[PDB]
Protein backbone atom coordinates (compact mmCIF):
# COMPACT_ATOMS: atom_id res chain seq x y z
CA UNK A 1 0.00 0.00 0.00
CA UNK A 2 1.52 3.14 1.38
CA UNK A 3 5.01 1.62 1.11
CA UNK A 4 6.95 -1.70 2.59
CA UNK A 5 6.47 -0.97 6.63
CA UNK A 6 9.03 -3.15 9.11
CA UNK A 7 7.66 -2.51 12.83
CA UNK A 8 10.39 -2.43 15.80
CA UNK A 9 8.99 -3.20 18.96
CA UNK A 10 10.91 -2.04 21.79
CA UNK A 11 11.51 -0.96 25.83
CA UNK A 12 11.22 2.86 25.37
CA UNK A 13 8.44 4.47 26.60
CA UNK A 14 9.77 7.24 23.95
CA UNK A 15 10.29 7.35 20.30
CA UNK A 16 14.17 6.04 19.25
CA UNK A 17 15.46 6.87 16.37
CA UNK A 18 16.07 4.33 13.49
CA UNK A 19 18.99 4.16 10.53
CA UNK A 20 18.22 2.10 7.52
CA UNK A 21 21.03 0.89 5.16
CA UNK A 22 21.28 -1.92 2.65
CA UNK A 23 24.36 -3.85 1.44
CA UNK A 24 25.41 -7.29 -0.09
CA UNK A 25 27.47 -9.74 0.40
CA UNK A 26 28.01 -8.93 3.90
CA UNK A 27 30.43 -11.61 5.72
CA UNK A 28 28.55 -14.53 6.35
CA UNK A 29 25.62 -13.72 3.26
CA UNK A 30 27.94 -14.87 0.05
CA UNK A 31 26.00 -17.57 -1.72
CA UNK A 32 29.25 -20.28 -2.00
CA UNK A 33 30.03 -19.38 1.64
CA UNK A 34 33.00 -17.59 3.94
CA UNK A 35 34.86 -14.86 1.47
CA UNK A 36 33.08 -15.98 -1.54
CA UNK A 37 31.80 -12.82 -2.80
CA UNK A 38 33.07 -10.24 -4.89
CA UNK A 39 33.88 -7.76 -2.55
CA UNK A 40 34.81 -9.10 1.29
CA UNK A 41 33.08 -7.62 4.33
CA UNK A 42 30.44 -6.24 1.80
CA UNK A 43 29.47 -4.07 -1.26
CA UNK A 44 27.92 -0.60 -1.38
CA UNK A 45 26.20 0.32 1.48
CA UNK A 46 23.08 2.67 0.60
CA UNK A 47 21.12 4.45 2.95
CA UNK A 48 17.96 3.86 2.68
CA UNK A 49 15.44 6.91 3.54
CA UNK A 50 12.58 5.98 5.68
CA UNK A 51 9.60 7.73 7.21
CA UNK A 52 9.15 6.73 10.81
CA UNK A 53 5.58 7.02 12.96
CA UNK A 54 5.39 5.87 16.60
CA UNK A 55 3.30 4.31 19.33
CA UNK A 56 4.49 3.14 22.79
CA UNK A 57 6.77 0.34 22.15
CA UNK A 58 6.55 -0.24 18.94
CA UNK A 59 8.15 1.71 15.72
CA UNK A 60 6.68 1.24 12.42
CA UNK A 61 9.66 2.10 9.72
CA UNK A 62 8.21 3.02 5.74
CA UNK A 63 10.67 2.44 3.31
CA UNK A 64 9.83 2.96 -0.19
CA UNK A 65 7.88 0.39 -2.24
CA UNK A 66 10.72 -0.71 -4.21
CA UNK A 67 13.07 -1.78 -1.10
CA UNK A 68 10.60 -5.05 -0.54
CA UNK A 69 11.70 -7.87 0.47
CA UNK A 70 11.27 -10.83 1.65
CA UNK A 71 13.51 -12.91 4.58
CA UNK A 72 14.74 -13.90 7.65
CA UNK A 73 14.72 -11.54 10.60
CA UNK A 74 17.85 -11.66 13.57
CA UNK A 75 17.31 -9.91 15.91
CA UNK A 76 21.01 -8.44 17.87
CA UNK A 77 19.08 -5.79 20.19
CA UNK A 78 21.35 -2.88 19.03
CA UNK A 79 20.11 -3.93 15.21
CA UNK A 80 18.00 -5.54 13.46
CA UNK A 81 18.81 -7.53 10.04
CA UNK A 82 16.49 -8.84 7.62
CA UNK A 83 18.28 -11.26 5.45
CA UNK A 84 17.29 -12.68 2.12
CA UNK A 85 19.77 -14.69 0.96
CA UNK A 86 22.81 -12.61 -0.01
CA UNK A 87 20.60 -8.58 0.98
CA UNK A 88 20.77 -7.14 4.11
CA UNK A 89 18.63 -4.59 5.35
CA UNK A 90 19.71 -3.27 8.51
CA UNK A 91 18.07 -1.16 11.22
CA UNK A 92 19.53 0.87 13.97
CA UNK A 93 17.81 2.00 17.12
CA UNK A 94 19.34 4.95 19.39
CA UNK A 95 18.63 4.80 22.44
CA UNK A 96 16.29 1.55 23.36
CA UNK A 97 17.01 -2.11 22.91
CA UNK A 98 14.92 -4.42 20.12
CA UNK A 99 12.62 -6.52 22.02
CA UNK A 100 10.97 -7.80 18.26
CA UNK A 101 10.92 -6.89 14.71
CA UNK A 102 9.35 -8.07 11.51
CA UNK A 103 7.70 -7.01 7.95
CA UNK A 104 4.01 -5.47 9.11
CA UNK A 105 1.67 -8.18 7.76
CA UNK A 106 -1.16 -7.28 9.87
CA UNK A 107 -1.96 -4.17 8.44
CA UNK A 108 -4.13 -1.22 9.64
CA UNK A 109 -7.41 -0.30 8.18
CA UNK A 110 -7.56 3.01 6.23
CA UNK A 111 -10.41 5.38 4.75
CA UNK A 112 -12.43 5.39 7.61
CA UNK A 113 -16.13 6.76 6.58
CA UNK A 114 -18.76 8.29 9.13
CA UNK A 115 -22.17 7.66 7.19
CA UNK A 116 -25.48 7.44 8.61
CA UNK A 117 -25.46 9.43 11.67
CA UNK A 118 -27.89 10.33 13.81
CA UNK A 119 -28.41 11.05 17.42
CA UNK A 120 -27.95 7.39 18.92
CA UNK A 121 -26.17 5.67 16.24
CA UNK A 122 -23.58 6.19 13.09
CA UNK A 123 -22.09 3.64 10.82
CA UNK A 124 -18.19 2.97 10.61
CA UNK A 125 -17.05 1.86 7.15
CA UNK A 126 -13.02 1.24 6.36
CA UNK A 127 -10.93 -0.50 3.59
CA UNK A 128 -8.14 -3.47 4.30
CA UNK A 129 -4.43 -1.59 5.08
CA UNK B 1 -45.26 -7.63 12.13
CA UNK B 2 -44.84 -3.75 10.71
CA UNK B 3 -41.96 -2.33 8.17
CA UNK B 4 -39.64 -1.53 10.72
CA UNK B 5 -36.28 -3.95 10.18
CA UNK B 6 -33.78 -4.31 12.63
CA UNK B 7 -30.06 -5.38 13.22
CA UNK B 8 -29.30 -7.96 15.76
CA UNK B 9 -26.10 -8.55 16.64
CA UNK B 10 -24.06 -11.43 19.24
CA UNK B 11 -20.75 -12.60 19.73
CA UNK B 12 -18.77 -15.62 20.82
CA UNK B 13 -15.71 -17.76 20.91
CA UNK B 14 -16.46 -20.84 18.68
CA UNK B 15 -17.64 -20.92 15.15
CA UNK B 16 -20.86 -22.36 15.83
CA UNK B 17 -21.94 -19.47 18.33
CA UNK B 18 -21.91 -21.50 21.34
CA UNK B 19 -18.98 -21.05 23.34
CA UNK B 20 -19.04 -17.73 25.40
CA UNK B 21 -22.02 -16.26 23.46
CA UNK B 22 -23.56 -13.01 24.16
CA UNK B 23 -25.65 -10.70 23.25
CA UNK B 24 -23.67 -7.25 24.62
CA UNK B 25 -19.98 -7.27 23.89
CA UNK B 26 -17.99 -7.54 26.96
CA UNK B 27 -16.78 -4.36 29.01
CA UNK B 28 -13.32 -3.91 30.63
CA UNK B 29 -12.95 -4.95 34.47
CA UNK B 30 -12.14 -2.07 36.82
CA UNK B 31 -10.91 -5.00 39.28
CA UNK B 32 -7.31 -6.38 40.14
CA UNK B 33 -6.02 -10.06 39.83
CA UNK B 34 -9.78 -11.34 39.21
CA UNK B 35 -7.93 -14.20 37.60
CA UNK B 36 -6.46 -15.43 40.94
CA UNK B 37 -3.01 -15.99 39.42
CA UNK B 38 -1.39 -15.37 42.54
CA UNK B 39 -1.87 -14.48 45.90
CA UNK B 40 -1.99 -10.24 45.22
CA UNK B 41 -4.31 -7.69 44.17
CA UNK B 42 -7.74 -8.69 44.76
CA UNK B 43 -6.68 -11.97 46.39
CA UNK B 44 -3.90 -10.57 48.39
CA UNK B 45 -6.11 -11.13 51.88
CA UNK B 46 -7.47 -14.64 51.05
CA UNK B 47 -5.51 -17.56 52.76
CA UNK B 48 -4.62 -19.19 49.24
CA UNK B 49 -5.02 -18.70 45.16
CA UNK B 50 -5.62 -22.21 43.81
CA UNK B 51 -6.83 -23.24 40.31
CA UNK B 52 -8.35 -20.22 38.95
CA UNK B 53 -10.05 -18.53 42.15
CA UNK B 54 -8.67 -17.31 45.93
CA UNK B 55 -10.31 -19.60 48.88
CA UNK B 56 -10.82 -18.01 52.43
CA UNK B 57 -12.24 -18.63 55.90
CA UNK B 58 -14.26 -16.84 57.92
CA UNK B 59 -14.01 -17.17 61.61
CA UNK B 60 -15.90 -15.06 64.74
CA UNK B 61 -17.87 -15.40 67.41
CA UNK B 62 -19.65 -12.04 68.39
CA UNK B 63 -17.46 -10.22 65.64
CA UNK B 64 -17.41 -8.42 62.55
CA UNK B 65 -14.59 -10.43 59.92
CA UNK B 66 -13.20 -8.95 57.00
CA UNK B 67 -10.74 -9.12 54.76
CA UNK B 68 -8.37 -6.17 52.72
CA UNK B 69 -9.98 -6.02 49.20
CA UNK B 70 -9.18 -2.58 48.51
CA UNK B 71 -5.68 -3.22 46.52
CA UNK B 72 -8.17 -5.28 43.90
CA UNK B 73 -9.72 -1.92 43.21
CA UNK B 74 -8.31 -0.26 39.70
CA UNK B 75 -9.19 3.25 40.80
CA UNK B 76 -10.48 5.03 44.48
CA UNK B 77 -14.39 4.70 44.27
CA UNK B 78 -14.19 9.13 44.84
CA UNK B 79 -13.61 8.91 41.06
CA UNK B 80 -16.90 7.69 40.22
CA UNK B 81 -19.59 10.36 39.54
CA UNK B 82 -22.64 10.50 41.85
CA UNK B 83 -25.18 8.61 39.76
CA UNK B 84 -23.17 6.52 37.79
CA UNK B 85 -24.56 3.09 37.64
CA UNK B 86 -21.44 0.29 37.84
CA UNK B 87 -22.42 -3.66 37.50
CA UNK B 88 -20.50 -6.36 40.18
CA UNK B 89 -20.57 -10.17 39.32
CA UNK B 90 -18.78 -12.46 40.79
CA UNK B 91 -18.79 -16.75 40.94
CA UNK B 92 -18.48 -18.17 44.27
CA UNK B 93 -18.16 -21.76 45.98
CA UNK B 94 -19.15 -22.54 49.90
CA UNK B 95 -17.63 -25.69 50.71
CA UNK B 96 -18.00 -25.64 54.58
CA UNK B 97 -20.57 -24.12 56.27
CA UNK B 98 -20.30 -24.24 60.65
CA UNK B 99 -22.83 -21.25 61.67
CA UNK B 100 -24.94 -23.24 64.73
CA UNK B 101 -28.45 -22.47 65.90
CA UNK B 102 -27.83 -19.20 67.57
CA UNK B 103 -25.64 -17.89 65.10
CA UNK B 104 -26.33 -15.25 62.98
CA UNK B 105 -25.37 -14.25 59.67
CA UNK B 106 -25.39 -10.41 59.05
CA UNK B 107 -23.37 -7.48 56.70
CA UNK B 108 -22.81 -10.53 54.45
CA UNK B 109 -21.15 -8.29 51.34
CA UNK B 110 -18.14 -7.57 49.33
CA UNK B 111 -18.07 -3.92 49.63
CA UNK B 112 -16.74 -0.15 48.25
CA UNK B 113 -18.20 2.50 50.70
CA UNK B 114 -17.20 5.17 52.53
CA UNK B 115 -15.85 5.06 56.31
CA UNK B 116 -16.14 7.12 59.72
CA UNK B 117 -19.10 8.89 60.32
CA UNK B 118 -20.74 7.81 56.73
CA UNK B 119 -20.36 4.06 56.53
CA UNK B 120 -22.82 4.77 53.06
CA UNK B 121 -22.07 2.21 50.38
CA UNK B 122 -20.68 3.48 47.05
CA UNK B 123 -20.57 -0.08 45.32
CA UNK B 124 -21.78 -3.32 47.02
CA UNK B 125 -22.98 -7.00 46.36
CA UNK B 126 -24.93 -9.09 49.31
CA UNK B 127 -23.20 -12.59 49.53
CA UNK B 128 -25.68 -15.63 50.28
CA UNK B 129 -26.85 -15.41 53.62
CA UNK B 130 -27.31 -19.48 54.25
CA UNK B 131 -25.57 -21.41 51.26
CA UNK B 132 -26.13 -24.79 53.51
CA UNK B 133 -28.01 -26.19 51.27
CA UNK B 134 -26.64 -25.13 47.93
CA UNK B 135 -22.35 -26.51 49.10
CA UNK B 136 -19.72 -27.16 46.51
CA UNK B 137 -21.69 -25.21 43.97
CA UNK B 138 -20.97 -21.82 41.87
CA UNK B 139 -23.27 -19.06 42.41
CA UNK B 140 -23.05 -16.44 39.94
CA UNK B 141 -23.90 -13.31 41.54
CA UNK B 142 -24.85 -9.99 39.76
CA UNK B 143 -25.73 -6.17 41.41
CA UNK B 144 -25.56 -3.02 39.91
CA UNK B 145 -25.29 -0.19 42.65
CA UNK B 146 -25.67 4.24 41.69
CA UNK B 147 -22.88 5.98 43.08
CA UNK B 148 -24.29 8.22 46.09
CA UNK B 149 -23.34 12.10 46.30
CA UNK B 150 -20.27 13.06 47.71
CA UNK B 151 -19.50 13.50 51.13
CA UNK B 152 -16.87 15.74 53.01
CA UNK B 153 -13.68 15.56 52.10
CA UNK B 154 -12.42 14.65 55.48
CA UNK B 155 -14.77 11.34 54.95
CA UNK B 156 -12.62 8.60 53.67
CA UNK B 157 -13.32 5.32 51.42
CA UNK B 158 -12.18 1.29 52.25
CA UNK B 159 -13.27 -1.76 49.60
CA UNK B 160 -13.81 -4.94 52.40
CA UNK B 161 -15.18 -8.23 52.13
CA UNK B 162 -16.74 -8.22 55.00
CA UNK B 163 -19.19 -11.03 56.88
CA UNK B 164 -20.91 -10.94 61.13
CA UNK B 165 -21.41 -13.79 63.54
CA UNK B 166 -23.72 -13.06 66.32
CA UNK B 167 -25.03 -15.24 68.60
CA UNK B 168 -23.69 -17.65 71.24
CA UNK B 169 -21.39 -19.97 69.36
CA UNK B 170 -18.49 -19.44 66.52
CA UNK B 171 -19.56 -19.59 63.33
CA UNK B 172 -17.20 -20.13 60.17
CA UNK B 173 -17.99 -20.83 56.38
CA UNK B 174 -14.51 -21.28 53.68
CA UNK B 175 -15.37 -19.76 50.37
CA UNK B 176 -14.10 -19.84 46.70
CA UNK B 177 -14.50 -16.47 45.01
CA UNK B 178 -13.71 -16.94 41.31
CA UNK B 179 -13.58 -13.78 38.32
CA UNK B 180 -14.97 -10.96 40.60
CA UNK B 181 -15.62 -8.13 38.28
CA UNK B 182 -16.86 -4.59 38.66
CA UNK B 183 -17.61 -2.67 35.28
CA UNK B 184 -19.25 0.75 34.53
CA UNK B 185 -22.89 0.36 33.42
CA UNK B 186 -26.10 -1.14 34.47
CA UNK B 187 -25.16 -4.86 32.55
CA UNK B 188 -23.13 -7.52 34.16
CA UNK B 189 -21.73 -8.04 30.45
CA UNK B 190 -18.74 -11.70 30.24
CA UNK B 191 -15.55 -11.92 32.42
CA UNK B 192 -12.96 -9.73 31.54
CA UNK B 193 -9.88 -8.81 32.83
CA UNK B 194 -8.84 -4.95 33.53
CA UNK B 195 -7.85 -2.74 30.99
CA UNK B 196 -3.34 -2.67 31.98
CA UNK B 197 -3.80 -7.11 31.91
CA UNK B 198 -6.22 -7.47 29.01
CA UNK B 199 -4.34 -8.78 25.67
CA UNK B 200 -5.87 -9.54 21.83
CA UNK B 201 -7.00 -13.00 22.77
CA UNK B 202 -9.12 -12.25 25.75
CA UNK B 203 -11.69 -10.77 23.21
CA UNK B 204 -14.83 -11.93 21.16
CA UNK B 205 -13.56 -14.03 17.97
CA UNK B 206 -16.96 -14.25 16.52
CA UNK B 207 -19.84 -11.98 15.59
CA UNK B 208 -23.33 -13.46 15.12
CA UNK B 209 -26.04 -11.59 12.90
CA UNK B 210 -29.71 -11.69 12.18
CA UNK B 211 -32.51 -9.08 10.94
CA UNK B 212 -35.97 -7.43 10.61
CA UNK B 213 -37.26 -9.12 13.44
CA UNK B 214 -38.78 -7.67 16.83
CA UNK B 215 -36.81 -5.12 18.23
CA UNK B 216 -35.48 -7.59 20.93
CA UNK B 217 -32.55 -9.41 19.93
CA UNK B 218 -32.88 -13.58 20.19
CA UNK B 219 -30.63 -15.38 23.03
CA UNK B 220 -30.68 -18.68 21.14
CA UNK B 221 -27.03 -18.98 19.33
CA UNK B 222 -28.32 -20.70 16.59
CA UNK B 223 -31.21 -17.67 15.54
CA UNK B 224 -27.22 -15.93 14.01
CA UNK B 225 -25.49 -16.05 11.19
CA UNK B 226 -21.79 -16.73 12.88
CA UNK B 227 -18.57 -15.80 11.15
CA UNK B 228 -14.79 -15.14 12.28
CA UNK B 229 -14.15 -11.31 12.97
CA UNK B 230 -11.55 -9.91 10.81
CA UNK B 231 -11.80 -6.22 12.67
CA UNK B 232 -12.19 -4.50 15.65
CA UNK B 233 -14.03 -1.18 16.66
CA UNK B 234 -12.70 0.90 19.53
CA UNK B 235 -15.13 3.81 20.39
CA UNK B 236 -12.89 6.66 22.33
CA UNK B 237 -10.36 3.93 22.97
CA UNK B 238 -12.89 1.25 24.23
CA UNK B 239 -13.67 -1.68 21.94
CA UNK B 240 -17.08 -1.68 21.04
CA UNK B 241 -17.35 -5.19 18.78
CA UNK B 242 -16.03 -5.55 15.41
CA UNK B 243 -17.22 -7.70 12.22
CA UNK B 244 -16.67 -9.87 8.98
CA UNK B 245 -17.37 -7.05 6.71
CA UNK B 246 -15.50 -3.73 6.13
CA UNK B 247 -18.30 -1.69 7.92
CA UNK B 248 -19.54 -1.91 11.50
CA UNK B 249 -22.83 0.29 12.99
CA UNK B 250 -22.03 2.04 16.32
CA UNK B 251 -25.24 2.11 18.69
CA UNK B 252 -26.78 3.55 21.25
CA UNK B 253 -24.80 6.79 21.42
CA UNK B 254 -26.27 9.82 22.66
CA UNK B 255 -27.55 12.89 21.42
CA UNK B 256 -25.15 15.91 20.36
CA UNK B 257 -21.77 14.55 21.96
CA UNK B 258 -18.44 13.99 19.96
CA UNK B 259 -17.15 10.43 19.34
CA UNK B 260 -13.96 9.18 18.02
CA UNK B 261 -13.40 5.78 16.22
CA UNK B 262 -10.44 3.96 15.41
CA UNK B 263 -10.59 0.10 13.87
CA UNK B 264 -7.65 -2.56 13.97
CA UNK B 265 -7.25 -5.94 11.95
CA UNK B 266 -7.96 -9.40 13.66
CA UNK B 267 -5.80 -12.27 11.71
CA UNK B 268 -6.43 -15.13 14.45
CA UNK B 269 -4.91 -13.31 18.26
CA UNK B 270 -2.77 -11.31 15.54
CA UNK B 271 -3.87 -7.82 15.34
CA UNK B 272 -2.97 -4.85 13.62
CA UNK B 273 -1.85 -1.58 15.47
CA UNK B 274 -5.40 0.48 15.45
CA UNK B 275 -6.45 3.03 12.31
CA UNK B 276 -6.05 6.51 12.29
CA UNK B 277 -9.03 7.74 14.48
CA UNK B 278 -11.82 9.63 12.79
CA UNK B 279 -14.37 11.80 14.51
CA UNK B 280 -18.00 12.77 14.29
CA UNK B 281 -20.88 14.50 16.42
CA UNK B 282 -24.11 12.46 16.82
CA UNK B 283 -27.31 14.72 15.92
CA UNK B 284 -29.38 16.73 18.30
CA UNK B 285 -33.09 16.06 18.37
CA UNK B 286 -36.32 18.59 18.09
CA UNK C 1 -49.83 -4.78 49.13
CA UNK C 2 -49.77 -8.99 48.37
CA UNK C 3 -46.19 -8.87 50.25
CA UNK C 4 -48.56 -8.22 54.26
CA UNK C 5 -51.71 -10.37 52.11
CA UNK C 6 -49.36 -13.49 51.42
CA UNK C 7 -47.69 -13.46 54.92
CA UNK C 8 -51.00 -13.10 56.94
CA UNK C 9 -52.20 -16.13 54.91
CA UNK C 10 -49.65 -18.68 55.66
CA UNK C 11 -49.14 -16.86 58.59
CA UNK C 12 -50.05 -20.16 61.25
CA UNK C 13 -48.18 -22.50 58.18
CA UNK C 14 -44.89 -24.47 58.00
CA UNK C 15 -45.49 -24.88 53.84
CA UNK C 16 -46.39 -22.40 51.13
CA UNK C 17 -46.72 -23.51 47.38
CA UNK C 18 -46.70 -21.21 44.54
CA UNK C 19 -46.65 -21.34 40.72
CA UNK C 20 -47.29 -18.94 37.94
CA UNK C 21 -50.70 -17.50 36.69
CA UNK C 22 -49.44 -18.34 33.21
CA UNK C 23 -48.21 -21.92 33.61
CA UNK C 24 -44.52 -20.67 32.71
CA UNK C 25 -40.86 -20.43 33.27
CA UNK C 26 -41.01 -17.86 36.01
CA UNK C 27 -42.86 -17.43 40.25
CA UNK C 28 -42.41 -14.48 41.85
CA UNK C 29 -43.86 -14.39 45.53
CA UNK C 30 -42.96 -12.58 49.18
CA UNK C 31 -41.94 -15.17 51.55
CA UNK C 32 -44.01 -15.25 54.00
CA UNK C 33 -41.26 -16.03 56.79
CA UNK C 34 -37.52 -16.99 56.75
CA UNK C 35 -38.07 -20.87 54.32
CA UNK C 36 -36.38 -23.30 52.31
CA UNK C 37 -37.48 -23.22 48.75
CA UNK C 38 -37.81 -26.20 46.61
CA UNK C 39 -38.43 -25.65 42.76
CA UNK C 40 -39.69 -28.55 40.35
CA UNK C 41 -40.53 -28.65 36.47
CA UNK C 42 -43.07 -29.73 35.04
CA UNK C 43 -43.88 -30.77 31.29
CA UNK C 44 -47.24 -31.65 30.12
CA UNK C 45 -49.00 -31.43 33.60
CA UNK C 46 -46.15 -34.25 34.40
CA UNK C 47 -42.65 -33.85 36.72
CA UNK C 48 -39.22 -34.59 35.08
CA UNK C 49 -35.62 -35.21 36.06
CA UNK C 50 -32.16 -34.24 34.33
CA UNK C 51 -31.52 -32.10 30.97
CA UNK C 52 -30.13 -28.49 31.27
CA UNK C 53 -31.17 -26.40 34.99
CA UNK C 54 -30.37 -22.73 35.09
CA UNK C 55 -31.96 -21.17 37.73
CA UNK C 56 -31.90 -17.86 38.23
CA UNK C 57 -33.46 -16.02 41.64
CA UNK C 58 -34.28 -12.08 41.51
CA UNK C 59 -35.10 -9.89 44.43
CA UNK C 60 -36.55 -5.71 43.74
CA UNK C 61 -33.00 -4.94 44.76
CA UNK C 62 -31.78 -5.76 42.01
CA UNK C 63 -29.97 -9.16 43.22
CA UNK C 64 -29.96 -11.48 41.80
CA UNK C 65 -28.19 -15.83 41.63
CA UNK C 66 -27.52 -17.81 38.53
CA UNK C 67 -27.08 -22.10 39.71
CA UNK C 68 -26.37 -23.63 36.49
CA UNK C 69 -26.43 -27.59 37.28
CA UNK C 70 -23.93 -30.02 36.14
CA UNK C 71 -25.04 -34.07 36.71
CA UNK C 72 -23.26 -36.20 38.55
CA UNK C 73 -21.54 -38.17 35.26
CA UNK C 74 -18.54 -39.25 37.40
CA UNK C 75 -19.12 -43.03 38.22
CA UNK C 76 -18.58 -46.06 37.04
CA UNK C 77 -23.70 -40.82 35.09
CA UNK C 78 -24.78 -43.56 34.36
CA UNK C 79 -27.58 -44.34 36.82
CA UNK C 80 -27.82 -41.02 38.49
CA UNK C 81 -31.02 -38.46 36.93
CA UNK C 82 -30.22 -35.28 38.28
CA UNK C 83 -31.71 -32.69 38.98
CA UNK C 84 -35.29 -34.09 40.16
CA UNK C 85 -35.67 -30.71 41.93
CA UNK C 86 -33.22 -27.74 43.17
CA UNK C 87 -33.20 -26.26 46.99
CA UNK C 88 -32.52 -22.99 48.28
CA UNK C 89 -31.40 -22.53 51.65
CA UNK C 90 -32.02 -19.08 52.95
CA UNK C 91 -34.74 -16.78 52.02
CA UNK C 92 -36.07 -14.44 54.60
CA UNK C 93 -39.65 -13.36 55.73
CA UNK C 94 -41.20 -10.36 53.57
CA UNK C 95 -38.49 -10.21 50.62
CA UNK C 96 -39.94 -11.01 47.31
CA UNK C 97 -38.20 -12.97 44.98
CA UNK C 98 -38.38 -14.34 41.65
CA UNK C 99 -37.43 -17.53 40.56
CA UNK C 100 -36.86 -18.51 36.99
CA UNK C 101 -35.57 -21.27 34.28
CA UNK C 102 -33.78 -19.70 32.26
CA UNK C 103 -34.09 -21.49 28.57
CA UNK C 104 -31.56 -24.21 27.17
CA UNK C 105 -29.62 -24.02 23.59
CA UNK C 106 -29.16 -27.37 22.88
CA UNK C 107 -31.32 -29.72 25.35
CA UNK C 108 -34.92 -30.73 28.02
CA UNK C 109 -38.51 -28.91 27.95
CA UNK C 110 -37.67 -25.64 26.50
CA UNK C 111 -40.70 -23.69 28.34
CA UNK C 112 -41.56 -25.63 30.90
CA UNK C 113 -44.00 -24.78 34.19
CA UNK C 114 -42.42 -24.23 37.56
CA UNK C 115 -43.54 -24.68 41.03
CA UNK C 116 -42.11 -23.48 44.28
CA UNK C 117 -42.28 -24.83 47.55
CA UNK C 118 -41.63 -23.21 50.42
CA UNK C 119 -40.77 -25.42 54.19
CA UNK C 120 -40.75 -22.94 56.99
CA UNK C 121 -37.59 -22.70 59.39
CA1 LIG D 1 -30.98 -16.76 48.64
Same mark, same amino acid.
Given at each position: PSGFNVVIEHDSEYQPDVKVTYYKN??? /??ANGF? /????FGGERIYNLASSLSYIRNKINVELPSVYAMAGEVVNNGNELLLINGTEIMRFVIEGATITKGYVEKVKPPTNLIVSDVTSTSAKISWENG | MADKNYLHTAYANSADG?????TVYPNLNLLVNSSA????????? =?DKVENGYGEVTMKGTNAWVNKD? %?? %? =? *? @??? @??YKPGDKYTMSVDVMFTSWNVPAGTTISAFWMRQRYTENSWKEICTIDLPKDPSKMLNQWIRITQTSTIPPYEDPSVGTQAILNVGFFGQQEGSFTIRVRNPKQELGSIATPYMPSASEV?????? +?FVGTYVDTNPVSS?? *? *? +?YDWDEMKYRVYLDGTPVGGSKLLSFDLENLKAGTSYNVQVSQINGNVESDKSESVAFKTTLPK | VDGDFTMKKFADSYVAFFANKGSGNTVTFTAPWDCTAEVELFYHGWGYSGGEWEIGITTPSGLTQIYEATG????????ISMPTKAIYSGLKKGLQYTFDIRDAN?????HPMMIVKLYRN
Open positions: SIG /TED /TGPV | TDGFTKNKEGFFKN =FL %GE %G =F *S @IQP @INTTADWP +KTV *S *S +K | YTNGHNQAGRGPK
